[PDB]
Each structure stands twice: as C-alpha cells, then as structure tokens.
C-alpha cells in the first residue's frame, strides 16, 4: 500500500552490511560471521513521522558473487557504500562499487551514503578525514556507524530515505 | 559459485549456501529461520510450484528437484 523504498547495502566481505541491516530491522547484533549470498528484509518505518515500507536487500562482500552487482544495482533506490574503519582495503574498494553503479545507471546521480562502520572498536586504520574527504569527492554524506552499539545505524539507512524524498 | 537454494519468508527473501545437493531439508530450513526469525512458532517449507504442502524435511534437497521454497508459519499460508 504505501511507499516502498528499495535499498541496498553494498561493501567488501566482513565489514557488517548484514549485522547493519539485521541491527535496524531487528535490533539485534549478529556476532558470528556468516557470509551473504543475497538476502533481502522487509519492514515498516516512520521517517519524518511519515510512515513508509523499506525494502533493504543485504549484498554479498565475496568476490565469488559478484556477477550478481549488475541486478541489485540496476533497480535499487539507494546505496550504502560500507566500510570498516579497521580495514584499509575495505575503504580503497569503496569506488569499485561506485563504478558499477555507474556503469549500469549511466551516473552516480543515485542516492548514497558513505558508512565508515565498527566504530565502537579501539584500533582504527582509516582515518576520519580521509573518510570524509572521500564522501566530499563524491558529494555524498559520510556517517559512522557500529551495528553494536546502533551509532548511527538509523541516521545511515533514514538518510537514504530522506534522500529519496527530497529528488 | 557455490550452490545455494532461494527461500521466500513473509518479509524477504534469503539465498542459502549448500555443499550438495545430499543436505536435508530440515538443515536449510533451520538455517533459514535462524537467519530471518533469530533465536516456539514452528514452519514449514514449500516447493515454489505446490503451495500449501509440506516438504518433508527428513529427505534430501536432490529428491525435491526444485532450487526454490517459500518459508511458511505452520500456522499461516503462503
Ligand atoms: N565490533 C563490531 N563488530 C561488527 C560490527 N559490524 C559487524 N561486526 C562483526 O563483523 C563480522 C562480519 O559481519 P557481517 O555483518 O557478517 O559482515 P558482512 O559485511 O555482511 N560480510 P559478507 O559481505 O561476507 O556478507 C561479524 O563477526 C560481526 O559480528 C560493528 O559495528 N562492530
Ligand atoms: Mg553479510
């Protein structure tokens, strides 16, 4: 019945797309490492005190799905482009899904956050500036995040909303 | 690529990974409720093209030949 909002949760293995989704649809942390296919998840929101369905399809990091990138990007509304602040390869493979995106909507025009997630651990390797400097290349918003803690899990996934809302 | 089966749960979907095609049922089904549902409501699971009926979940997902289930409360319908 009501609007739906198609979003996708893209990033390299291990850097917590699933424990972010799971973490906002369920409120619950994922502590075992599981490594996605595809899975999707259903759930009514109030954004903005207007209500909405969003519709969070849950990518694989492993290099051995990505021949599925093309379908998911093609049809999704908005991305969050994940990394792990621990992780510098996870931050350097940040543009190579830009650019998939690009390929098959002949833009980057899509709504996107950048998501620099784990921010409840100590030891970090991908500086602040360097996250944020990279989202103002892109012209799109940086956020951090933890799916332990929820810090910022709901300013991540409603920004995409927002986002959607205001074309 | 591994193999994998697709199953349709009430809010979404979810690909599961199989070794082979010798896994029960019941194994794909306990794995797709733990990742959907979490840690009694009770399912089943139904080949996509015979809604209503329970596969049996004691016989191996080779002797279903279907790669997609839809995941169903026991007390519900698809
Ligand atoms: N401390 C901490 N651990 C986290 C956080 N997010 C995820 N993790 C942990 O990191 C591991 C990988 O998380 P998961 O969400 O499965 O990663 P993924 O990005 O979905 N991996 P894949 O692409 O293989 O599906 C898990 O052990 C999970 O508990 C976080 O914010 N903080
Ligand atoms: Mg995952």
Same mark, same amino acid.
């Given at each position: 019945s009501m609007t739906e909002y198609k979003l996708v949760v893209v990033g390299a293995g291990?850097?917590?797309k699933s424990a972010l989704t799971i973490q906002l649809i369920q409120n619950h942390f994922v502590d075992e490492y599981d490594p996605t296919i595809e899975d999707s998840y259903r759930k009514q929101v109030v954004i903005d005190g207007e209500t909405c369905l969003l519709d969070i399809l849950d990518?694989?990091?492993?290099?051995?799905?990505?021949?599925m990138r093309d379908q998911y990007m093609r049809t &999704?509304?908005?991305?969050?482009?994940? +990394?792990?602040?621990?992780?510098?390869?996870? +931050?350097?493979?940040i543009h190579q899904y830009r650019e998939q995106i690009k390929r098959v909507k002949d833009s980057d025009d899509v709504p996107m956050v950048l998501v620099?997630?784990?921010?409840?651990?100590?030891?970090?390797?991908?500086?602040?500036?360097?996250?944020?400097?990279?989202?103002?290349?892109? &012209?799109?918003?940086?956020?951090?995040?933890?799916?332990?803690?929820?810090?910022?899990?709901?300013?991540? +996934?409603?920004?995409?909303?927002?986002?959607?809302?205001?074309? | 690529e591994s193999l994998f089966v697709r199953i349709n749960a009430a809010h979404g979907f979810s690909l599961i990974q199989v070794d082979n095609t010798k896994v029960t049922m019941k194994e794909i089904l306990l794995k797709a409720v733990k990742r959907r549902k979490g840690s009694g409501p009770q399912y089943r699971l139904e080949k996509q093209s015979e809604p209503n009926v329970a596969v049996d979940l004691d016989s191996?997902?080779?002797?279903?030949?279907?790669?997609? +289930?839809?995941?169903?409360?026991?007390?519900s319908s698809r």
């Open positions: 291990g850097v917590g990518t694989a990091g492993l290099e051995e799905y990505s021949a &999704g509304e908005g991305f969050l482009c994940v +990394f792990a602040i621990n992780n510098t390869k996870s +931050f350097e493979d620099g997630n784990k921010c409840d651990l100590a030891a970090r390797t991908v500086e602040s500036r360097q996250a944020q400097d990279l989202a103002r290349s892109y &012209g799109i918003p940086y956020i951090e995040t933890s799916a332990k803690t929820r810090q910022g899990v709901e300013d991540a +996934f409603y920004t995409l909303v927002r986002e959607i809302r205001q074309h | 191996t997902l080779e002797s279903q030949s279907a790669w997609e +289930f839809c995941l169903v409360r026991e007390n």
